[PDB]
Assembly symmetry: none
Homo-oligomer: 144 residues x 6
Amino acid sequence: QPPQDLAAEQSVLGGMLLSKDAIADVLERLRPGDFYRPAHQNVYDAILDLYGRGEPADAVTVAAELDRRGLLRRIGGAPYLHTLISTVPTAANAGYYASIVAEKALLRRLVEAGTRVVQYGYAGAEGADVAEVVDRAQAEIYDV
Amino acid sequence: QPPQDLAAEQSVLGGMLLSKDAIADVLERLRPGDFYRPAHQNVYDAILDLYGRGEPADAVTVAAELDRRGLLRRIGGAPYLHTLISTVPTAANAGYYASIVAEKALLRRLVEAGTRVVQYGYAGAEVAEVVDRAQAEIYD
Amino acid sequence: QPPQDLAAEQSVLGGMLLSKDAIADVLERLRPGDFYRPAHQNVYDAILDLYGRGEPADAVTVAAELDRRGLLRRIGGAPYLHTLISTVPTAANAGYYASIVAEKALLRRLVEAGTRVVQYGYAGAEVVDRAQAEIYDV
Amino acid sequence: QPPQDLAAEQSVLGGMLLSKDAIADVLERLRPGDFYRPAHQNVYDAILDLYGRGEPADAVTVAAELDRRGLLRRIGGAPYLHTLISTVPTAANAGYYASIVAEKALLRRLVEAGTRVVQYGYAGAEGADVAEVVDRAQAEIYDVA
Amino acid sequence: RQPPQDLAAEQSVLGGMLLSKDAIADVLERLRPGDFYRPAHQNVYDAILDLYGRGEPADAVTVAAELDRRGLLRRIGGAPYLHTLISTVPTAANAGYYASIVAEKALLRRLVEAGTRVVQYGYAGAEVVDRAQAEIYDV
Amino acid sequence: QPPQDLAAEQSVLGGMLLSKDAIADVLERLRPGDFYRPAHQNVYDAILDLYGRGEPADAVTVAAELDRRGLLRRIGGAPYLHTLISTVPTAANAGYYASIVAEKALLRRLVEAGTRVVQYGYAGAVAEVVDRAQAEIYDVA
């Protein structure tokens, strides 16, 4: 089970749906890819799409952005967004929760890179010489 | 499967046991740690200890050096040393065989390093020291 | 199945009930016909009636206006009006919610248009024309 | 079942196989894709292939054009072409029957375009704005109109 | 697999030739007796050409007589089959078009026969390669 | 069974594994694809690979090269290379065996070209079809 904090992911998304100011704080710390759960990445991307267009991102506008993308039934609909809101009182701590999500994502990519390096050792790189295999494995750990 | 090449290892050793020139060509690209078979690392270490003394390293003298270390029986005795000499295609080519051993060793080091990094990632999950150590491991 | 966003409809209505400025924003984007739910169409008409006569349109006064048209029970009464007011995230965003309702209404008119061109096909230039009209009319 | 007239399709093809004047008449009215039955479209396309080349289109030359296309066995061989010819006395009425086939094709394309529009309505804005959804819908009917 | 051929086109060519002297001129430009798949058809074709070459009319009656005197009338299905040929041709003036179908099918059949010989030259074991080339380049 | 000579393929490869000089004799007579068995084509390609960068090509290096390529388990491992060597006393006849392999590869390409021609004749649809069949035999010739 890869490094993750699903509770922190829920709090981040809930905070973002409650406050525009929390979105700016989260953008500071997170990338799309940092969310372990694909549904959470979908929600995050929908929030950012609306925010980047200067449109409000709340339970209603976000559900509609998801639906336009055909993604609403995959997250579990508008009732999931309401569940996300309820994991946090207010959006005050959103940056803090985003820092947990980012730290767990670093660790998870470290684990993924490490397993990829192992895969390089056992299998090489499509017939490449060991020198190339070693350069590729070193870049894997660099890209964390 | 652990990256290794049995015949290349046997052939490096056989070439060395037959030719002092072969030892010079192998020393440049190998450490005893490069051998996957513990018997081979033992035999290699015995050859180099004698070579560092001016003592000719052939099957007989190597057997005596390994016996002295209490390692002769462990490595398969005189009969295994004989297998090594019969195996090498060409003693003059020991350098090429060595490069094969060296490459397999590198690949094995990746498996060990990668495995360590995975462990650090799980340890961190229980971060800056973790990431840095993981990078020490791979760049080494 | 029919394209619709019931939460967006509720939030348009809730915003208008909580804010006079919201009504002005929604007016530029919607027709009563855009609402899927008949109950929402009636609530909307009631707000616009109050508004057009310069009268305050809140939960209480709108209920009074619906009662007079004989529709308060039909739309779900004061409990339902309370639901609308609870549902809207932010009343000042009522225009954004209206855009959503309008977009769904357009998609729904597309389904409706396509369905009737199909019906025209199985019936019978007499039909080609009427069907042509239906989909540029969307 | 989609708007169609199989009897009128047979009569059109029979007429065309009997007379070059009938092919010309039919061409005034029909477009590629107008035949409901795939075997009938294949026969029609083979006749038009020959006619566009200034070659005659009779049972022999058409069976060979179909055979070159690997479609002769698909439709039941030259005996099928002889059956089509037997559906008509002369090729006098070929344009009349083509007008039936064309009307049914118009109506079928309307049914097909309609259901395509419905599909777009339900699967809306997948990639757009909704304007490009509406435009795809209108492009469907332009094709028909 | 069926060797490439079109038996209806073969019948129509011969039918048209029996019905029109101009058709024989048209067909002569496009065919040889060997283009016909059925031996019976080659025999009829040869008879027509022999008559034609002598300035003699070639019709159901005169062709049967030519064939009979060759000892081939019975072999080709008699005077009744000559009637089958004449009733088959959709339009005699289109003989040239039916001949192109027969010519094209004979070309395809020669490819099949040539490819088959080449395969056999492979299994028979510089001489073979030359023979195999000659087979394909003379199709 | 397609024109082939498995024994001569083994003997060619064994000769090449025994003598650098025989690699030159063989490549004088063989082209890519001449081996009937894919494993043999792999072995051959590995030998020329090592040859081209002036490395010795013996049972140890060739095996390592094939392993790099993911092809060693496919030939049966390093012991097969030892079986190939054991198939000939010395590499003296390597050119002779390569000439047999070349010949059979010619006759096999002739068989394949021929069956493709048969397929062109059945496929139909004319002047371009004839030219295709001829390009087929041009390749062999």
